[PDB]
């Protein structure tokens, strides 16, 4: 009775939210951008091929200097590369082989990794002795670590397979904030450029917008049919894109509280593992399970071009802060730099 | 330039050389060691099988290292993960084998049907299509006790058991009852129906009747892993 009442209340509240979102849908984004010129044909080429990972690369993160990058493979190595010269700067052996995520601190002083050991480990790259050693182990999660992103040197937001996200204080090692509300495994997170909010995509086919200081979910976005593997903010912070196992990418607006565009094709029936934007946000780059990456017109939903240099599944994608290069990692143990 | 740029490039090529020298040794250790994923339910007997390998030689994953005939094996057991496994199972694609332990006596209402559904999902997953499964139908003593007691019937939970007959290629143990043998090979053929239907994959299934305390479980793993790697080697020499 009471539980039934609560269900019917939540159902009429979902109908109120759906009608309020439909009241703002005066005209679509494709109708707005139907009279702008198209980007043409983007023909990016492979400039570098980083080699040296024994096993499949799960995750890659660009540093803020747009030159050094970190890559995590399941052989137990973190490799920090120098993408200009293809030299290797660091090779960190991990305690747990089964890593699933890596992150580069914006200061370049730290890297983080985690995976099936349910721990986020912080490695200090600027030690006094010069060797790379583990600085902190964050062990509060009860599921696999799927994504982590530094806010600064002392803060990091993690997403986990225990349906929760967390905000950590690295100096004390404790969870300062727990972000609860997702029902499925949270697969990816993306910080806003001001780092006051972040979005998280999960296996409940939903993305949530979270306030970092308040610790509450502000908005919930739906529209994807299956598990969301990837999420990335638009450069101005007022939109974000998602990649899911329903073979579609979707653009959601924060202020309109709904989806603006679907990036899909009938020849694609494979899931998206990673998404990223270009510097102006005009191009949406998505990595796919059929070993290719697609470059989409983010304003017209046209497929601008194909990055087709990998033999196994493309697992991670990153665009530099200056917008010069795209890095794609894959399950064939290779990182490729394109432009 | 040559003032500082040459010195920096020299230092970064020497650091890349020292890293590649460490990664050749790590490539040899990676290639020599064989990795196994141990899967099973909470009452399948897998914990006893780990304790049995550990006597001879909350965390998100547990590791057991054992050596057979100077061949190193690392077996990974999953703990403190949720029961939703469609994401993290994709990490185990590259392992030599998945050791799937099933309590065969548990024919929840039907733990054997749940193990068959989990085996079907593992077998037909798009990322695990080249990963071989070593299948341990465990607790053959409890299965023999329940079959010879005659209280619980397999025909209630598996109605096609009544039309089942023991295969002519069966090799029963000496002194084993024929009803126990027919129940063993029906439980084995339920998994082998799944394993022998899915095409376009480089996976093989190796079923074994086992009890948790068998000394020879590790040898059963070794002889299966020796065949899996052999098949992989043969792939290098394939023509068409």
């Amino acid at each position: 009775s009471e539980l039934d009442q609560l269900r019917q209340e939540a159902e009429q509240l979902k109908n109120q939210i759906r009608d309020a979102r439909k009241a703002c849908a005066d005209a679509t984004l494709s109708q707005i951008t139907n009279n702008i010129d198209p980007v043409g044909r983007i023909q990016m080429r492979t400039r570098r091929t980083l080699r040296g990972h024994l096993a499949k690369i799960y995750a890659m993160h660009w540093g803020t200097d747009s030159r050094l990058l970190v890559s995590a493979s399941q052989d137990g190595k973190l490799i920090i590369w120098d993408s200009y010269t293809t030299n290797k700067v660091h090779a960190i052996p991990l305690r747990s082989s089964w890593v699933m995520t890596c992150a580069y601190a914006p200061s370049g002083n730290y890297v983080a990794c985690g995976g099936l050991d349910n721990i986020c480990s912080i490695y200090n790259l600027k030690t006094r002795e010069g060797n790379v050693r583990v600085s902190r182990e964050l062990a509060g999660h009860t599921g696999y670590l799927s994504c982590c992103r530094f806010l600064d040197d002392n803060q990091i937001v993690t997403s986990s397979g225990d349906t929760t996200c967390a905000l950590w204080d690295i100096e004390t090692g404790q969870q300062t904030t727990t972000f609860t509300g997702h029902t499925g495994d949270v697969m990816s997170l993306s910080l806003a450029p001001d780092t006051r909010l972040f979005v998280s995509g999960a296996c409940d086919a939903s993305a949530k917008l979270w306030d970092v200081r308040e610790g509450m979910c502000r908005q919930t976005f739906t529209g994807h049919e299956s598990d969301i593997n990837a999420i990335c903010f638009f450069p101005n912070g007022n939109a974000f894109a998602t990649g899911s196992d329903d073979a579609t990418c979707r653009l959601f607006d924060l202020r309109a509280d709904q989806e603006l565009m679907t990036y899909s094709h009938d020849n694609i029936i494979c899931g998206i593992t990673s998404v990223s934007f270009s510097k102006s946000g005009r191009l949406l780059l998505a990595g796919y399970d059929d070993f290719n990456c697609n470059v989409w017109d983010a304003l017209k939903a046209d497929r601008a071009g194909v990055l087709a240099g990998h033999d196994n599944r493309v697992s991670c994608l990153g665009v530099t802060d200056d917008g010069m290069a795209v890095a794609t990692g894959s399950w064939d143990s290779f990182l490729k730099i394109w432009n | 330039k040559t003032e500082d740029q040459r010195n920096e490039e020299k230092a970064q090529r020497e650091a890349n050389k020292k890293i590649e020298k460490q990664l050749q040794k790590d490539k040899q250790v990676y290639r020599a060691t064989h990795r196994l994923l141990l899967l099973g339910a909470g009452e399948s007997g897998k914990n006893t099988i780990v304790k049995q390998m550990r006597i001879l030689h909350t965390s998100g994953i547990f590791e057991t290292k054992f050596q057979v005939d100077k061949v190193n094996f690392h077996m990974f057991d999953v703990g403190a993960q949720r029961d939703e496994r469609r994401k993290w199972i994709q990490c185990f694609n590259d392992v030599t084998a998945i050791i799937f332990v099933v309590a065969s006596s548990s024919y929840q209402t039907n733990r054997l049907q749940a193990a068959l559904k989990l085996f079907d999902s593992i077998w037909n997953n798009k990322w695990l299509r080249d990963t071989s499964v070593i299948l341990f139908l465990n607790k053959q003593d409890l299965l023999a006790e329940k079959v010879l007691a005659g209280k619980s019937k397999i025909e209630d939970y598996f109605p096609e058991f009544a039309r089942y007959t023991t295969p002519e290629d069966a090799t029963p143990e000496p002194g084993e009852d024929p009803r126990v043998t027919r129940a063993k090979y029906f439980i084995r053929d339920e998994f082998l129906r799944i394993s022998t239907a899915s095409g376009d994959g480089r996976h093989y299934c190796y079923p074994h009747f086992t009890c948790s305390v068998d000394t020879e479980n590790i040898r059963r793993v070794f002889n299966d892993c020796r065949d899996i790697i052999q098949r992989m080697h043969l792939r290098q020499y394939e023509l068409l």
């Epitope: 086919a205 739906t222 329903d246 | 949720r82 939703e84 079907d120 899915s198």
Partner: nanobody, 128 residues
């Protein structure tokens, strides 16, 4: 939003029949393998039946085989389950579950405790 709504349950005498229905919205229904699972009181979730995308491949669990029939209508986005010859062991909350990814042969986690692509479930009680 992915939404699944079960209906058609209730109380029946033993030997009776029921027809359960699952109305699906928020996804392309013809791209997914569908499932029926159930949860008896005091027990865990138990898989009952599944049907493939085209309806050609159909499987049941052993205790309901010959009594339960699963079917789908892709035009109406509806999943049906005809439960003839009901026993008191069939008293359960019956859930309509969707396989998590389209165009896949495998189907993980549909009997998990907190699976997302599963409806609220309808109660079927078989008693005298």
């Amino acid at each position: 939003q992915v939404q699944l709504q079960e209906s058609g349950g209730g109380l029946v005498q033993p030997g009776g029949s029921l027809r359960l229905s699952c109305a699906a919205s928020g996804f392309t229904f013809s791209n997914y393998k569908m499932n029926w699972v159930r949860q008896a009181p005091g027990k865990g979730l138990e898989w009952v039946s599944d049907i493939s995308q085209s309806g050609a491949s159909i499987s049941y669990t052993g205790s309901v085989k010959g009594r339960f029939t699963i079917s789908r209508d892709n035009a109406k986005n509806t999943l049906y389950l005809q439960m003839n010859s009901l026993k008191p062991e069939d008293t359960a909350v019956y859930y309509c579950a969707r396989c998590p990814a389209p165009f896949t042969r495998d189907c993980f986690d549909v009997t998990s405790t907190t699976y997302a692509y599963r409806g609220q479930g309808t109660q079927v009680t078989v008693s005298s």
